[PDB]
């Protein structure tokens, strides 16, 4: 019974660690996503002021 309790407590801890990893990965990749989508705006700016 205590082994089950410790196993599920460690499961909660490991899934909390995985949740933190997902959170910081999502934060950095959302910064990257914003950077890339803004780079699309820079690219459309440059090709409009060059072509037109």
């Amino acid at each position: 019974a205590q082994g089950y309790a410790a196993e599920i407590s460690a499961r909660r801890n490991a899934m909390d660690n995985a949740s933190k990893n997902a959170g910081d990965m999502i934060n950095r990749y959302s910064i990257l996503y914003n950077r890339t989508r803004q780079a699309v705006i820079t690219n459309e700016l440059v090709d409009i002021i060059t072509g037109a």
């Binding site: 989508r37 459309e44 037109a52």
Partner: protein, 473 residues
């Protein structure tokens, strides 16, 4: 006075260049009517090219454009018919009715572009609008004279929601309405007109209450870009001279800004403001600012915002997010569950949703229902991953009541009988609040959740409960 005329020198797709004589050069945003064999074509100036030449955008199909043809100026922007006679008739951006039912003998004729109301005329709206839909009457009440936004993607039911709004408002309010079809599909347009005819709002042999300013996407980009301001002109003419509350319905503001960027692409219009259109701020503010609750009347602008795969990074949806005051997002996921209205109870906020404006009881009921549904989707994940039995009894009661309320959100539309077959239910805001309070109070917890589904009032709830009890056994 001699008519002001010139000769066409260039036609680049939808862009036509016309040369005028000395002192014959007109102003921008004017009308350059050219007698075409395929009806009548008129061009609107965008910029002066010098050498007595004007760069214009075709307001109608550019078939048959020849350099040197005699194009006569109308002395200003192409005046569209404005008045009570315009009700029940589809009017395009060029003022030539596409219903072959005779010319609109309007009281007056106003240009599309006009000076927006002054800063003093601007005011806030704090009056409840009865729309006949329970969920949006309670959780996100409409504002009489405000700017409403009907967010939603594809297959979510925006245009049908707009036409249901027009039908319910016309039934429950005698004020005239206008529906501008910016970027409106022709098949969707025929559906809209058939629904208007069958709902009684448009009466061919009598008096109507809605005028269509259909855009007809297959016309050149200028028509799509200017049908919105044409419908806005209709709305302000109805507001000022008649002195009555009117209902402006934008078909798709996203299509309007797309057409603005498009017509920018045809012309020079080096995009600087947002990236795809440098003028976008100018004409966007000129349009939105013109819907204002002036001292003559109030214009409620219900615009539909289409977000493609939640493209919130683009400035275009954010610009519309800045204009409006109360949102009615129509997320598809809710419609996939069975509640075809698809309006999200927690994401459709209202500026005037406060005890001081909508009422203490109304605000309390709306807030409690929103909290119950928020707990519903908060515990839905654990219910799915674990089950229902382990959930606490208080949370069990809350989730059951939230399921009942969510079924209650779906309401029959008088405009949806051609697809559902269920007669529409025109509910009242007070009736909606009373029914929601009674359901949330637990007096009808024993009633199955299917009873609240696809019904109107609580009497309809118990009627469907009896019907489903009979069907089951």
């Amino acid at each position: 006075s001699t008519p002001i005329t010139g000769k066409v020198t260039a036609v680049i797709g939808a862009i036509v260049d016309v040369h005028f004589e000395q002192s014959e050069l007109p102003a921008i945003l004017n009308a350059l009517e050219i007698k075409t064999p395929q009806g009548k074509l008129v061009l609107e100036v965008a910029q002066h090219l010098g050498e007595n030449t004007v760069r214009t955008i075709a307001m109608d199909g550019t078939e048959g454009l020849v350099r040197g043809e005699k194009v006569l100026d109308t002395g200003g922007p192409i005046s569209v018919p404005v008045g009570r006679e315009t009700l029940g008739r589809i009017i395009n951006v060029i003022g030539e009715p596409i219903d072959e039912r005779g010319p609109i003998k309007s009281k007056l004729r106003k240009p599309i572009h006009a000076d927006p109301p002054s800063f003093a005329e601007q005011s806030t709206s704090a009056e409840i609008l009865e729309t006949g839909i329970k969920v949006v009457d309670l959780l996100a009440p409409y504002a009489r004279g405000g700017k409403i936004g009907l967010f939603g993607g594809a297959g979510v039911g925006k245009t049908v929601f707009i036409q249901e709004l027009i039908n319910n408002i016309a039934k429950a309010h005698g004020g005239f309405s206008v529906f501008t079809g910016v970027g409106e599909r022709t098949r969707e347009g025929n559906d809209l007109y058939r629904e208007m005819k069958e709902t009684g709002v448009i009466n061919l042999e009598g008096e109507s209450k809605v005028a269509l300013v259909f855009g007809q996407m297959n016309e050149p980009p200028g028509a799509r870009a200017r049908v919105a301001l044409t419908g806005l002109t209709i709305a302000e003419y109805f507001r000022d001279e008649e002195g009555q509350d009117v209902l402006l319905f934008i078909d798709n503001i996203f299509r309007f800004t797309q057409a603005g960027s498009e017509v920018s692409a045809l012309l020079g219009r080096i995009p600087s403001a947002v990236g795809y259109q440098p003028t976008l701020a100018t004409d966007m503010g000129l349009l939105q600012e013109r819907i204002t609750t002036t001292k003559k009347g109030s214009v409620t602008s219900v615009q539909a915002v289409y977000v493609p795969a939640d493209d919130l990074t683009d400035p275009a949806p954010a610009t519309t997010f800045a204009h409006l005051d109360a949102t009615t997002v129509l997320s598809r996921g809710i419609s996939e569950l069975g509640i075809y209205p698809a309006v999200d109870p927690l994401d459709s906020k209202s500026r005037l949703l406060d005890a001081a404006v909508v009422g203490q009881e109304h605000y309390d009921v709306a807030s409690k229902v929103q909290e119950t549904l928020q707990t519903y989707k908060s515990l839905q994940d654990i219910i799915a991953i674990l089950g229902m039995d382990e959930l606490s009894e208080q949370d069990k009661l809350t989730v059951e009541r939230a399921r009942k309320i969510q079924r209650f959100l779906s309401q029959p539309f008088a405009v949806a009988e051609v697809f559902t077959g269920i007669p529409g239910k025109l509910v009242r805001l007070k009736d909606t609040v009373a029914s929601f309070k009674a359901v949330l109070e637990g007096k009808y917890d024993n009633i199955p959740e299917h009873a609240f589904y696809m019904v109107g009032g609580i009497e309809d709830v118990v009627a469907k409960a009896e019907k489903l009890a009979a069907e089951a056994n």
